[PDB]
Amino acid sequence: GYTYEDYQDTAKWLLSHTEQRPQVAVICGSGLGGLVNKLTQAQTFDYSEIPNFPESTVPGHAGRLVFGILNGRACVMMQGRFHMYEGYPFWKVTFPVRVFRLLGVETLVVTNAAGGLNPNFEVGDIMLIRDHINLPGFSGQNPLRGPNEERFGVRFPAMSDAYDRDMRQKAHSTWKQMGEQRELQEGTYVMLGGPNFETVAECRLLRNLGADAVGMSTVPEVIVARHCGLRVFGFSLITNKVIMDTGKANHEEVLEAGKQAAQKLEQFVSLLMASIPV
Ligand SMILES: Nc1nc2ncn(CCNC(CO)CO)c2c(=O)[nH]1
Ligand SMILES: [Mg+2]
Ligand SMILES: [Zn+2]
C-alpha cells in the first residue's frame, strides 16, 4: 500500500501547517466526537485536505484531524475513524497511526462504542480495554501482512502487553476522584468485521470465548501502534447490552448513547490527560 516516504510526506505536511507538536494522539469512535470541544488553541484539518489520508464515510465520524491543548497537554485527535467494513484494507485503516509516530507522538488513546457481552455491564458503562481478541487476524487479515518495514518495528511483534498496565492503574485512580456511582469496568474487546450486527448464536459464542465487549474497529490500530513503539491506552463506551436469548441493534441508538455520556467521557479524558508520563 504505502511506502515509508508516504508517511514522511504526510508528516512533513502536518508539521509545516501548524505550530502544534502533540505528545498524545486520541482516536475518537462512534459518537465520541464531542471530545474535540474544550480543546484550546485548536486547529482543524479535514481528512480530505491532508495528503494521503483516507476518508470517514460512517455517520457519526466527522472526518477531521484536530490539534490542540486538552488539559495542559498538547494532543491530536481523530474525530472519526476508518473501518474495514467501509471497504478499506487494514493498511489504510491504520495509516494515521504511523503518521502520528512520525510527528513525535508517544502515547495513543483508542476509544470506541461497543456492545456489552458481559452480563454485568450496563448501558453507559465505560470499560477499560485490558486485552483483545483479533478474529480477522486469525485468518490473516492483518495490517502488518506483507514485507516488514524495519524503520517502524520488528517482523514479529508481541501483543501480550499491548494495553499499558500503568495507564490502566492511573485510569482507575482518576475514576475514583470523580466520585462516580458506577465502577470502572475492565475487560477483553473482540473485533469482528461488520457491518451487520451479530446474531444471538454469534453473541453466545463470543461470550463463551471470553469476550466482554464487541466492536468493528480499534484492534488494527493497536497492533500497528505497538509495532512502531507507541504506548497504548483504550476504552469502550458500552452502548448496549447484547441480546443472548431467542429488540435489535441500530446505529442511531449507539450514537444516542454517546451523546448521553458526553459529559462523563469528556471529564474522564481531560483528567486522564494530566496523568500521562514523559
Ligand atoms: N450489539 C452491538 N452493539 C454495538 N455497539 C457498537 N458496536 C460496534 C459496531 N459499530 C458500528 C455500528 O454501531 C459503527 O462503527 C456494536 C456491535 O458490534 N454490536
Ligand atoms: Mg492556531
Ligand atoms: Zn499549505
PDB file of C-alpha atoms and ligand atoms in Angstrom:
ATOM      1  CA  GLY A   1       0.000   0.000   0.000  1.00  0.00           C
ATOM      2  CA  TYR A   2       2.137   2.891   1.259  1.00  0.00           C
ATOM      3  CA  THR A   3       5.896   3.433   1.204  1.00  0.00           C
ATOM      4  CA  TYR A   4       7.853   4.779   4.173  1.00  0.00           C
ATOM      5  CA  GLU A   5       8.150   8.027   2.200  1.00  0.00           C
ATOM      6  CA  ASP A   6       4.412   8.386   2.022  1.00  0.00           C
ATOM      7  CA  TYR A   7       4.185   8.523   5.787  1.00  0.00           C
ATOM      8  CA  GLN A   8       7.060  11.003   5.836  1.00  0.00           C
ATOM      9  CA  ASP A   9       5.452  13.330   3.302  1.00  0.00           C
ATOM     10  CA  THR A  10       2.207  13.446   5.242  1.00  0.00           C
ATOM     11  CA  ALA A  11       4.093  14.012   8.493  1.00  0.00           C
ATOM     12  CA  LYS A  12       6.134  16.882   6.983  1.00  0.00           C
ATOM     13  CA  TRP A  13       2.930  18.380   5.568  1.00  0.00           C
ATOM     14  CA  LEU A  14       1.297  18.440   9.016  1.00  0.00           C
ATOM     15  CA  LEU A  15       4.409  19.771  10.766  1.00  0.00           C
ATOM     16  CA  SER A  16       4.572  22.713   8.404  1.00  0.00           C
ATOM     17  CA  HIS A  17       0.872  23.671   8.621  1.00  0.00           C
ATOM     18  CA  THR A  18       0.500  24.020  12.373  1.00  0.00           C
ATOM     19  CA  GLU A  19       2.763  25.023  15.226  1.00  0.00           C
ATOM     20  CA  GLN A  20       1.248  22.332  17.476  1.00  0.00           C
ATOM     21  CA  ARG A  21       3.562  19.463  18.450  1.00  0.00           C
ATOM     22  CA  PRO A  22       1.350  16.779  20.093  1.00  0.00           C
ATOM     23  CA  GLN A  23       2.658  14.223  22.579  1.00  0.00           C
ATOM     24  CA  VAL A  24      -0.540  12.193  22.597  1.00  0.00           C
ATOM     25  CA  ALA A  25      -2.950  11.067  19.899  1.00  0.00           C
ATOM     26  CA  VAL A  26      -6.593  10.260  20.525  1.00  0.00           C
ATOM     27  CA  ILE A  27      -8.790   8.302  18.124  1.00  0.00           C
ATOM     28  CA  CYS A  28     -12.471   9.035  18.789  1.00  0.00           C
ATOM     29  CA  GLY A  29     -15.034   6.367  17.967  1.00  0.00           C
ATOM     30  CA  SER A  30     -18.723   6.468  17.022  1.00  0.00           C
ATOM     31  CA  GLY A  31     -20.490   9.216  18.981  1.00  0.00           C
ATOM     32  CA  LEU A  32     -17.300  10.193  20.779  1.00  0.00           C
ATOM     33  CA  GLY A  33     -16.501  13.136  18.543  1.00  0.00           C
ATOM     34  CA  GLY A  34     -17.595  15.679  21.147  1.00  0.00           C
ATOM     35  CA  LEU A  35     -14.267  15.234  22.970  1.00  0.00           C
ATOM     36  CA  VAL A  36     -12.845  17.799  20.496  1.00  0.00           C
ATOM     37  CA  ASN A  37     -14.531  20.821  22.197  1.00  0.00           C
ATOM     38  CA  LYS A  38     -12.806  22.021  25.327  1.00  0.00           C
ATOM     39  CA  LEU A  39      -9.616  21.605  23.292  1.00  0.00           C
ATOM     40  CA  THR A  40      -7.961  25.008  23.355  1.00  0.00           C
ATOM     41  CA  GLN A  41      -5.882  26.649  20.601  1.00  0.00           C
ATOM     42  CA  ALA A  42      -7.441  24.099  18.278  1.00  0.00           C
ATOM     43  CA  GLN A  43      -6.521  23.690  14.639  1.00  0.00           C
ATOM     44  CA  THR A  44      -8.671  21.570  12.370  1.00  0.00           C
ATOM     45  CA  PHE A  45      -7.835  19.807   9.108  1.00  0.00           C
ATOM     46  CA  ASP A  46     -10.453  17.874   7.132  1.00  0.00           C
ATOM     47  CA  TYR A  47      -9.106  14.454   6.289  1.00  0.00           C
ATOM     48  CA  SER A  48      -9.663  15.364   2.637  1.00  0.00           C
ATOM     49  CA  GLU A  49      -7.176  18.209   2.625  1.00  0.00           C
ATOM     50  CA  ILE A  50      -4.294  16.172   4.124  1.00  0.00           C
ATOM     51  CA  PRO A  51      -2.157  14.340   1.555  1.00  0.00           C
ATOM     52  CA  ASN A  52      -2.569  10.533   1.552  1.00  0.00           C
ATOM     53  CA  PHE A  53      -5.333  10.424   4.241  1.00  0.00           C
ATOM     54  CA  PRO A  54      -8.418   8.114   3.817  1.00  0.00           C
ATOM     55  CA  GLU A  55     -11.980   9.415   4.262  1.00  0.00           C
ATOM     56  CA  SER A  56     -14.598   8.806   7.038  1.00  0.00           C
ATOM     57  CA  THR A  57     -17.843   7.618   5.416  1.00  0.00           C
ATOM     58  CA  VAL A  58     -19.721   6.432   8.523  1.00  0.00           C
ATOM     59  CA  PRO A  59     -22.427   8.512  10.223  1.00  0.00           C
ATOM     60  CA  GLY A  60     -21.003   9.949  13.442  1.00  0.00           C
ATOM     61  CA  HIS A  61     -17.430  10.370  12.177  1.00  0.00           C
ATOM     62  CA  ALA A  62     -16.703  13.988  11.218  1.00  0.00           C
ATOM     63  CA  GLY A  63     -13.510  13.138   9.355  1.00  0.00           C
ATOM     64  CA  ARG A  64     -11.378  15.862  10.928  1.00  0.00           C
ATOM     65  CA  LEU A  65      -7.888  15.878  12.455  1.00  0.00           C
ATOM     66  CA  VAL A  66      -7.806  18.333  15.372  1.00  0.00           C
ATOM     67  CA  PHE A  67      -4.676  19.682  17.138  1.00  0.00           C
ATOM     68  CA  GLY A  68      -4.937  21.445  20.477  1.00  0.00           C
ATOM     69  CA  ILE A  69      -4.240  21.628  24.213  1.00  0.00           C
ATOM     70  CA  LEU A  70      -6.567  19.453  26.299  1.00  0.00           C
ATOM     71  CA  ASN A  71      -5.759  19.792  29.998  1.00  0.00           C
ATOM     72  CA  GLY A  72      -2.388  21.456  29.763  1.00  0.00           C
ATOM     73  CA  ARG A  73      -1.394  18.666  27.356  1.00  0.00           C
ATOM     74  CA  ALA A  74      -0.711  19.006  23.630  1.00  0.00           C
ATOM     75  CA  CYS A  75      -2.568  16.424  21.599  1.00  0.00           C
ATOM     76  CA  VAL A  76      -4.038  15.470  18.269  1.00  0.00           C
ATOM     77  CA  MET A  77      -7.438  13.929  17.792  1.00  0.00           C
ATOM     78  CA  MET A  78      -9.050  11.893  15.079  1.00  0.00           C
ATOM     79  CA  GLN A  79     -12.680  12.979  15.131  1.00  0.00           C
ATOM     80  CA  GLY A  80     -13.845   9.993  13.181  1.00  0.00           C
ATOM     81  CA  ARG A  81     -12.008   6.863  12.213  1.00  0.00           C
ATOM     82  CA  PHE A  82     -11.876   4.231   9.466  1.00  0.00           C
ATOM     83  CA  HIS A  83     -13.345   0.707   9.435  1.00  0.00           C
ATOM     84  CA  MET A  84     -12.703  -2.384   7.392  1.00  0.00           C
ATOM     85  CA  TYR A  85     -16.415  -2.744   6.529  1.00  0.00           C
ATOM     86  CA  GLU A  86     -16.212   0.613   4.749  1.00  0.00           C
ATOM     87  CA  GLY A  87     -14.003  -1.163   2.229  1.00  0.00           C
ATOM     88  CA  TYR A  88     -10.511  -0.183   3.429  1.00  0.00           C
ATOM     89  CA  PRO A  89      -7.731  -2.791   3.809  1.00  0.00           C
ATOM     90  CA  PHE A  90      -6.036  -2.594   7.228  1.00  0.00           C
ATOM     91  CA  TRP A  91      -3.010  -0.771   5.787  1.00  0.00           C
ATOM     92  CA  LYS A  92      -5.346   2.143   5.017  1.00  0.00           C
ATOM     93  CA  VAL A  93      -7.296   1.927   8.281  1.00  0.00           C
ATOM     94  CA  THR A  94      -4.062   2.316  10.232  1.00  0.00           C
ATOM     95  CA  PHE A  95      -2.237   4.909   8.096  1.00  0.00           C
ATOM     96  CA  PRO A  96      -2.750   7.668  10.627  1.00  0.00           C
ATOM     97  CA  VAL A  97      -1.052   5.695  13.443  1.00  0.00           C
ATOM     98  CA  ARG A  98       2.323   5.626  11.685  1.00  0.00           C
ATOM     99  CA  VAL A  99       1.968   9.315  10.773  1.00  0.00           C
ATOM    100  CA  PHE A 100       1.486  10.129  14.473  1.00  0.00           C
ATOM    101  CA  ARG A 101       4.654   8.231  15.350  1.00  0.00           C
ATOM    102  CA  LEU A 102       6.451  10.334  12.738  1.00  0.00           C
ATOM    103  CA  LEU A 103       5.193  13.570  14.412  1.00  0.00           C
ATOM    104  CA  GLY A 104       6.754  12.579  17.708  1.00  0.00           C
ATOM    105  CA  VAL A 105       3.661  11.220  19.420  1.00  0.00           C
ATOM    106  CA  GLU A 106       4.437   8.725  22.181  1.00  0.00           C
ATOM    107  CA  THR A 107       1.031   7.744  23.529  1.00  0.00           C
ATOM    108  CA  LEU A 108      -2.078   6.611  21.695  1.00  0.00           C
ATOM    109  CA  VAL A 109      -5.518   6.609  23.279  1.00  0.00           C
ATOM    110  CA  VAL A 110      -8.091   4.484  21.418  1.00  0.00           C
ATOM    111  CA  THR A 111     -11.776   4.765  22.035  1.00  0.00           C
ATOM    112  CA  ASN A 112     -14.922   3.128  20.640  1.00  0.00           C
ATOM    113  CA  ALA A 113     -18.570   2.282  21.204  1.00  0.00           C
ATOM    114  CA  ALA A 114     -19.182  -1.447  21.621  1.00  0.00           C
ATOM    115  CA  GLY A 115     -21.787  -3.992  22.523  1.00  0.00           C
ATOM    116  CA  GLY A 116     -21.714  -5.455  26.007  1.00  0.00           C
ATOM    117  CA  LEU A 117     -21.386  -9.241  26.223  1.00  0.00           C
ATOM    118  CA  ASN A 118     -20.510  -9.440  29.942  1.00  0.00           C
ATOM    119  CA  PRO A 119     -23.945  -9.582  31.623  1.00  0.00           C
ATOM    120  CA  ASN A 120     -22.691  -7.341  34.478  1.00  0.00           C
ATOM    121  CA  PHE A 121     -22.271  -4.408  32.091  1.00  0.00           C
ATOM    122  CA  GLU A 122     -24.895  -1.650  31.877  1.00  0.00           C
ATOM    123  CA  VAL A 123     -25.626   0.705  29.015  1.00  0.00           C
ATOM    124  CA  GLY A 124     -23.497   3.805  29.608  1.00  0.00           C
ATOM    125  CA  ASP A 125     -20.653   1.892  31.285  1.00  0.00           C
ATOM    126  CA  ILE A 126     -17.049   2.571  30.491  1.00  0.00           C
ATOM    127  CA  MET A 127     -14.817  -0.421  30.017  1.00  0.00           C
ATOM    128  CA  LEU A 128     -11.028  -0.174  30.087  1.00  0.00           C
ATOM    129  CA  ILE A 129      -9.568  -2.486  27.444  1.00  0.00           C
ATOM    130  CA  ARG A 130      -7.240  -4.885  29.283  1.00  0.00           C
ATOM    131  CA  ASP A 131      -6.825  -7.137  26.238  1.00  0.00           C
ATOM    132  CA  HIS A 132      -8.296  -8.021  22.832  1.00  0.00           C
ATOM    133  CA  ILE A 133      -9.226 -10.891  20.535  1.00  0.00           C
ATOM    134  CA  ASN A 134      -8.425 -10.248  16.839  1.00  0.00           C
ATOM    135  CA  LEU A 135     -10.749 -12.500  14.861  1.00  0.00           C
ATOM    136  CA  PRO A 136      -9.721 -11.171  11.421  1.00  0.00           C
ATOM    137  CA  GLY A 137      -6.120 -11.770  12.386  1.00  0.00           C
ATOM    138  CA  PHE A 138      -6.905 -15.437  12.928  1.00  0.00           C
ATOM    139  CA  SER A 139      -7.489 -15.658   9.184  1.00  0.00           C
ATOM    140  CA  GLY A 140      -4.619 -13.481   8.064  1.00  0.00           C
ATOM    141  CA  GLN A 141      -6.279 -10.066   7.702  1.00  0.00           C
ATOM    142  CA  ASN A 142      -3.644  -8.061   9.460  1.00  0.00           C
ATOM    143  CA  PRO A 143      -2.207  -4.578   8.907  1.00  0.00           C
ATOM    144  CA  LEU A 144       1.360  -5.997   9.193  1.00  0.00           C
ATOM    145  CA  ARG A 145       0.812  -8.550   6.418  1.00  0.00           C
ATOM    146  CA  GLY A 146       3.461  -8.265   3.693  1.00  0.00           C
ATOM    147  CA  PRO A 147       7.121  -7.170   3.754  1.00  0.00           C
ATOM    148  CA  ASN A 148       8.091  -5.673   7.123  1.00  0.00           C
ATOM    149  CA  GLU A 149       9.241  -2.057   7.384  1.00  0.00           C
ATOM    150  CA  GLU A 150      12.262  -2.234   9.700  1.00  0.00           C
ATOM    151  CA  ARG A 151      12.071   1.508  10.256  1.00  0.00           C
ATOM    152  CA  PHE A 152       8.776   1.105  12.124  1.00  0.00           C
ATOM    153  CA  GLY A 153       9.292  -2.115  14.028  1.00  0.00           C
ATOM    154  CA  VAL A 154      10.203  -5.781  14.034  1.00  0.00           C
ATOM    155  CA  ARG A 155       8.949  -8.663  11.905  1.00  0.00           C
ATOM    156  CA  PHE A 156       7.172 -10.472  14.787  1.00  0.00           C
ATOM    157  CA  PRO A 157       5.936  -8.005  17.451  1.00  0.00           C
ATOM    158  CA  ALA A 158       4.485  -9.347  20.707  1.00  0.00           C
ATOM    159  CA  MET A 159       0.913  -8.332  21.616  1.00  0.00           C
ATOM    160  CA  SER A 160       0.509  -9.799  25.097  1.00  0.00           C
ATOM    161  CA  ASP A 161       1.330  -6.476  26.789  1.00  0.00           C
ATOM    162  CA  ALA A 162      -0.477  -4.213  24.313  1.00  0.00           C
ATOM    163  CA  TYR A 163      -2.526  -2.262  26.811  1.00  0.00           C
ATOM    164  CA  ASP A 164      -0.190  -0.370  29.089  1.00  0.00           C
ATOM    165  CA  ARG A 165      -0.579  -1.508  32.722  1.00  0.00           C
ATOM    166  CA  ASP A 166       0.414   1.778  34.388  1.00  0.00           C
ATOM    167  CA  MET A 167      -2.138   3.850  32.450  1.00  0.00           C
ATOM    168  CA  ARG A 168      -4.841   1.383  33.355  1.00  0.00           C
ATOM    169  CA  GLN A 169      -3.863   1.776  37.044  1.00  0.00           C
ATOM    170  CA  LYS A 170      -3.952   5.588  36.615  1.00  0.00           C
ATOM    171  CA  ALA A 171      -7.359   5.405  34.931  1.00  0.00           C
ATOM    172  CA  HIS A 172      -8.674   3.582  37.994  1.00  0.00           C
ATOM    173  CA  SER A 173      -7.327   6.225  40.366  1.00  0.00           C
ATOM    174  CA  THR A 174      -8.689   9.068  38.239  1.00  0.00           C
ATOM    175  CA  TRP A 175     -12.120   7.483  38.185  1.00  0.00           C
ATOM    176  CA  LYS A 176     -12.304   7.337  41.981  1.00  0.00           C
ATOM    177  CA  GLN A 177     -11.516  11.039  42.160  1.00  0.00           C
ATOM    178  CA  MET A 178     -14.600  11.663  40.033  1.00  0.00           C
ATOM    179  CA  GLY A 179     -16.875  10.191  42.696  1.00  0.00           C
ATOM    180  CA  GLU A 180     -18.805   8.165  40.087  1.00  0.00           C
ATOM    181  CA  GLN A 181     -21.585   5.907  41.332  1.00  0.00           C
ATOM    182  CA  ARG A 182     -20.816   3.233  38.734  1.00  0.00           C
ATOM    183  CA  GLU A 183     -17.477   1.470  38.929  1.00  0.00           C
ATOM    184  CA  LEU A 184     -14.939   1.463  36.121  1.00  0.00           C
ATOM    185  CA  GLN A 185     -15.308  -1.774  34.155  1.00  0.00           C
ATOM    186  CA  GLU A 186     -12.323  -3.555  32.556  1.00  0.00           C
ATOM    187  CA  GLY A 187     -12.284  -6.365  30.022  1.00  0.00           C
ATOM    188  CA  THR A 188     -11.442  -8.055  26.730  1.00  0.00           C
ATOM    189  CA  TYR A 189     -12.570  -6.459  23.499  1.00  0.00           C
ATOM    190  CA  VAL A 190     -13.246  -8.640  20.485  1.00  0.00           C
ATOM    191  CA  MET A 191     -13.222  -7.395  16.935  1.00  0.00           C
ATOM    192  CA  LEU A 192     -15.235  -8.771  14.048  1.00  0.00           C
ATOM    193  CA  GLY A 193     -15.738  -7.429  10.512  1.00  0.00           C
ATOM    194  CA  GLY A 194     -19.187  -5.870  10.349  1.00  0.00           C
ATOM    195  CA  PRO A 195     -21.113  -4.032   9.041  1.00  0.00           C
ATOM    196  CA  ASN A 196     -24.131  -6.119  10.093  1.00  0.00           C
ATOM    197  CA  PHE A 197     -24.889  -6.596  13.776  1.00  0.00           C
ATOM    198  CA  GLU A 198     -24.433 -10.045  15.355  1.00  0.00           C
ATOM    199  CA  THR A 199     -26.967 -12.861  15.695  1.00  0.00           C
ATOM    200  CA  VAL A 200     -27.883 -14.414  19.028  1.00  0.00           C
ATOM    201  CA  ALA A 201     -25.853 -17.519  18.257  1.00  0.00           C
ATOM    202  CA  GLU A 202     -22.851 -15.374  17.410  1.00  0.00           C
ATOM    203  CA  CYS A 203     -23.056 -13.372  20.673  1.00  0.00           C
ATOM    204  CA  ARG A 204     -23.312 -16.506  22.789  1.00  0.00           C
ATOM    205  CA  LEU A 205     -20.257 -17.785  21.037  1.00  0.00           C
ATOM    206  CA  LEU A 206     -18.282 -14.555  21.558  1.00  0.00           C
ATOM    207  CA  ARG A 207     -19.118 -14.546  25.241  1.00  0.00           C
ATOM    208  CA  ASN A 208     -18.032 -18.147  25.678  1.00  0.00           C
ATOM    209  CA  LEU A 209     -14.670 -17.310  24.071  1.00  0.00           C
ATOM    210  CA  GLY A 210     -14.102 -14.865  26.939  1.00  0.00           C
ATOM    211  CA  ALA A 211     -15.077 -11.565  25.310  1.00  0.00           C
ATOM    212  CA  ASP A 212     -16.619  -8.715  27.323  1.00  0.00           C
ATOM    213  CA  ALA A 213     -17.387  -6.276  24.505  1.00  0.00           C
ATOM    214  CA  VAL A 214     -17.717  -6.407  20.712  1.00  0.00           C
ATOM    215  CA  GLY A 215     -16.912  -3.911  18.025  1.00  0.00           C
ATOM    216  CA  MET A 216     -15.679  -3.460  14.455  1.00  0.00           C
ATOM    217  CA  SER A 217     -12.575  -1.341  14.979  1.00  0.00           C
ATOM    218  CA  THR A 218      -9.661  -0.442  17.209  1.00  0.00           C
ATOM    219  CA  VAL A 219      -7.631  -3.692  17.113  1.00  0.00           C
ATOM    220  CA  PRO A 220      -5.880  -2.932  13.774  1.00  0.00           C
ATOM    221  CA  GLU A 221      -4.840   0.432  15.227  1.00  0.00           C
ATOM    222  CA  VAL A 222      -3.452  -1.044  18.491  1.00  0.00           C
ATOM    223  CA  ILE A 223      -1.425  -3.597  16.546  1.00  0.00           C
ATOM    224  CA  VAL A 224       0.243  -1.045  14.272  1.00  0.00           C
ATOM    225  CA  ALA A 225       0.737   1.222  17.324  1.00  0.00           C
ATOM    226  CA  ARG A 226       2.516  -1.420  19.306  1.00  0.00           C
ATOM    227  CA  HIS A 227       4.610  -2.360  16.233  1.00  0.00           C
ATOM    228  CA  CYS A 228       6.047   1.153  15.923  1.00  0.00           C
ATOM    229  CA  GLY A 229       6.605   1.607  19.655  1.00  0.00           C
ATOM    230  CA  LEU A 230       3.689   3.676  20.937  1.00  0.00           C
ATOM    231  CA  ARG A 231       2.318   3.240  24.444  1.00  0.00           C
ATOM    232  CA  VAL A 232      -1.391   2.372  24.193  1.00  0.00           C
ATOM    233  CA  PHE A 233      -4.440   3.014  26.336  1.00  0.00           C
ATOM    234  CA  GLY A 234      -8.049   2.332  25.414  1.00  0.00           C
ATOM    235  CA  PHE A 235     -11.686   2.023  26.411  1.00  0.00           C
ATOM    236  CA  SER A 236     -15.103   1.132  25.037  1.00  0.00           C
ATOM    237  CA  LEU A 237     -18.268   3.056  25.783  1.00  0.00           C
ATOM    238  CA  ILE A 238     -20.803   0.294  26.300  1.00  0.00           C
ATOM    239  CA  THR A 239     -23.710   1.327  24.053  1.00  0.00           C
ATOM    240  CA  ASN A 240     -25.944  -1.678  24.649  1.00  0.00           C
ATOM    241  CA  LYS A 241     -26.455  -4.998  26.301  1.00  0.00           C
ATOM    242  CA  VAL A 242     -26.413  -7.569  23.516  1.00  0.00           C
ATOM    243  CA  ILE A 243     -29.393  -9.973  23.185  1.00  0.00           C
ATOM    244  CA  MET A 244     -28.481 -13.506  24.296  1.00  0.00           C
ATOM    245  CA  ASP A 245     -31.937 -15.096  24.215  1.00  0.00           C
ATOM    246  CA  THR A 246     -34.067 -16.009  21.215  1.00  0.00           C
ATOM    247  CA  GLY A 247     -35.305  -5.717  20.321  1.00  0.00           C
ATOM    248  CA  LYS A 248     -32.498  -5.150  17.809  1.00  0.00           C
ATOM    249  CA  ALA A 249     -29.286  -3.142  17.465  1.00  0.00           C
ATOM    250  CA  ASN A 250     -29.219   0.024  15.340  1.00  0.00           C
ATOM    251  CA  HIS A 251     -26.516   2.666  14.859  1.00  0.00           C
ATOM    252  CA  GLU A 252     -28.787   5.609  15.832  1.00  0.00           C
ATOM    253  CA  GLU A 253     -29.161   4.103  19.289  1.00  0.00           C
ATOM    254  CA  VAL A 254     -25.362   3.777  19.694  1.00  0.00           C
ATOM    255  CA  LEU A 255     -24.898   7.434  18.719  1.00  0.00           C
ATOM    256  CA  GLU A 256     -27.641   8.439  21.157  1.00  0.00           C
ATOM    257  CA  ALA A 257     -25.729   6.675  23.953  1.00  0.00           C
ATOM    258  CA  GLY A 258     -22.608   8.618  23.036  1.00  0.00           C
ATOM    259  CA  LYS A 259     -24.354  11.968  23.428  1.00  0.00           C
ATOM    260  CA  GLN A 260     -25.677  10.941  26.865  1.00  0.00           C
ATOM    261  CA  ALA A 261     -22.206  10.004  28.135  1.00  0.00           C
ATOM    262  CA  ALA A 262     -20.500  13.109  26.661  1.00  0.00           C
ATOM    263  CA  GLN A 263     -20.143  14.950  29.966  1.00  0.00           C
ATOM    264  CA  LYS A 264     -18.682  11.828  31.613  1.00  0.00           C
ATOM    265  CA  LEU A 265     -16.184  10.859  28.905  1.00  0.00           C
ATOM    266  CA  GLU A 266     -15.079  14.461  28.491  1.00  0.00           C
ATOM    267  CA  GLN A 267     -14.101  14.961  32.110  1.00  0.00           C
ATOM    268  CA  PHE A 268     -12.647  11.474  32.270  1.00  0.00           C
ATOM    269  CA  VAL A 269     -10.339  12.080  29.293  1.00  0.00           C
ATOM    270  CA  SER A 270      -9.465  15.589  30.481  1.00  0.00           C
ATOM    271  CA  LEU A 271      -8.389  14.397  33.923  1.00  0.00           C
ATOM    272  CA  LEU A 272      -6.577  11.408  32.441  1.00  0.00           C
ATOM    273  CA  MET A 273      -4.500  13.752  30.316  1.00  0.00           C
ATOM    274  CA  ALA A 274      -2.788  15.060  33.428  1.00  0.00           C
ATOM    275  CA  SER A 275      -1.658  11.535  34.265  1.00  0.00           C
ATOM    276  CA  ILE A 276       0.361  10.646  31.177  1.00  0.00           C
ATOM    277  CA  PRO A 277       4.146  10.470  31.883  1.00  0.00           C
ATOM    278  CA  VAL A 278       7.161  11.650  29.817  1.00  0.00           C
TER     279      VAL A 278
HETATM  280  N1  LIG B   1     -24.752  -5.284  19.652  1.00  0.00           N
HETATM  281  C1  LIG B   1     -23.749  -4.430  19.302  1.00  0.00           C
HETATM  282  N2  LIG B   1     -23.768  -3.156  19.794  1.00  0.00           N
HETATM  283  C2  LIG B   1     -22.745  -2.377  19.303  1.00  0.00           C
HETATM  284  N3  LIG B   1     -22.409  -1.088  19.700  1.00  0.00           N
HETATM  285  C3  LIG B   1     -21.337  -0.699  18.923  1.00  0.00           C
HETATM  286  N4  LIG B   1     -20.943  -1.674  18.150  1.00  0.00           N
HETATM  287  C4  LIG B   1     -19.818  -1.687  17.205  1.00  0.00           C
HETATM  288  C5  LIG B   1     -20.261  -1.555  15.765  1.00  0.00           C
HETATM  289  N5  LIG B   1     -20.243  -0.125  15.496  1.00  0.00           N
HETATM  290  C6  LIG B   1     -20.842   0.237  14.196  1.00  0.00           C
HETATM  291  C7  LIG B   1     -22.335   0.487  14.353  1.00  0.00           C
HETATM  292  O1  LIG B   1     -22.606   0.996  15.631  1.00  0.00           O
HETATM  293  C8  LIG B   1     -20.273   1.559  13.712  1.00  0.00           C
HETATM  294  O2  LIG B   1     -18.860   1.528  13.717  1.00  0.00           O
HETATM  295  C9  LIG B   1     -21.772  -2.748  18.388  1.00  0.00           C
HETATM  296  C10 LIG B   1     -21.775  -4.082  17.842  1.00  0.00           C
HETATM  297  O3  LIG B   1     -20.984  -4.565  17.009  1.00  0.00           O
HETATM  298  N6  LIG B   1     -22.809  -4.882  18.375  1.00  0.00           N
HETATM  299 MG    MG B   2      -3.929  28.123  15.959  1.00  0.00          MG
HETATM  300 ZN    ZN B   3      -0.180  24.815   2.599  1.00  0.00          ZN
END
